[PDB]
C-alpha cells in the first residue's frame, strides 16, 4: 500500500494540483540458505518457538525472527511446551538449554 | 464492420495465465516475502503457521491437526469444480 517492502513511515509534499508521498520501506538485500524444522523435541515433548523459526548452520540449530537473521540459542524462555513428538511431522531432536539450572547449582 | 473498431488487448490470453502462475509460486513458495523483496523460500507446511500467528491462533494447532488441515483444504478446492459447473 505504501510501496514496495516493508512499510516504516512516509513523508508529504506539496505538488501543483497533486501531492507528492515519499514512502520509506524496509527492504532486504541479502540472503542465505538454512535448514529449518517445525519443532524440536528435547525430552519427548514437542517444543515451538514463541517468535520466530529454528534454524540451522549444519552442526547445531539456533532459533531466529523472520526478517532478520539473529541466531540465539535455544531456551525455555523463547520456545512454549505443547502436544508431543508423535504428531507433529518432520520434528527433529535438540537438547533445550535450561537458564535455570546453573543458577540452582551455584 | 461499419466503423466499429475492436481494438486487441496489448495482454494475450496466455499472457495473463503466465502473470496469475508467477503469483501462485511465489505464495505457495515463498508466502508474502515475494512481494515485499525477493523470493524467501519457506516450507508449505511452516507458512501455514505463521498465517494462524496472525490471527491469534498458535502454531501447535497446525502441527497437530496438519492432516485434518490439508484434508479439509483439499475438499474445499475441489467443491469449487461442482460448485461453478452446476451454478452458472
Ligand atoms: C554453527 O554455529 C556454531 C555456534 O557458533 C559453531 O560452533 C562454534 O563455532 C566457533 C566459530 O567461531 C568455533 O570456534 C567453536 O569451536 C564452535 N563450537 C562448537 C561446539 O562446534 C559451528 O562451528 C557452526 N557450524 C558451521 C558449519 O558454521
Ligand atoms: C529423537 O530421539 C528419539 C529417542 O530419544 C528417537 O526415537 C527412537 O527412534 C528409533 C528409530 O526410529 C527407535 O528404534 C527407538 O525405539 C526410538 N526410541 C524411543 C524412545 O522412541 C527419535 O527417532 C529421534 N528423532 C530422530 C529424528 O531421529
Ligand atoms: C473437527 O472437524 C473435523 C471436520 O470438520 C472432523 O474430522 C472428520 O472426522 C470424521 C469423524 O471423526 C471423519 O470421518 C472424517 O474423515 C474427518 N475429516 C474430514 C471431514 O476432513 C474432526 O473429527 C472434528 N473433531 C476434532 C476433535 O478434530
Ligand atoms: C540455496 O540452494 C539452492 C540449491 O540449488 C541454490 O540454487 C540457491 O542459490 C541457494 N541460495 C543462495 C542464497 O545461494
Ligand atoms: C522431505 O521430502 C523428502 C522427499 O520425499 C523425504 O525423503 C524427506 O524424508 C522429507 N523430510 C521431512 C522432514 O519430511
Redesign the interface.
Known sequence: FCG???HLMSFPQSAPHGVVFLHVTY???Q?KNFT?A??ICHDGK?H??REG?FVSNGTHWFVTQ?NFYEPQIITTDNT?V??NCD????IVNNTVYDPLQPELDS | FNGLTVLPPLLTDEMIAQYTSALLAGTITSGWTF????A?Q??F??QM??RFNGIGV???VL??N?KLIANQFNSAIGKIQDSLSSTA
Open positions: 514496495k517492502g516493508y527492504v532486504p538485500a540472503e529449518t517445525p519443532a514437542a515451538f518457538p523459526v523472520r512454549f505443547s502436544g504428531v507433529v511431522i518432520g | 512481494g515485499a523483496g525477493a524467501l519457506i516450507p507446511a511452516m503457521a505463521y498458535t502454531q501447535n502441527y497437530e496438519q
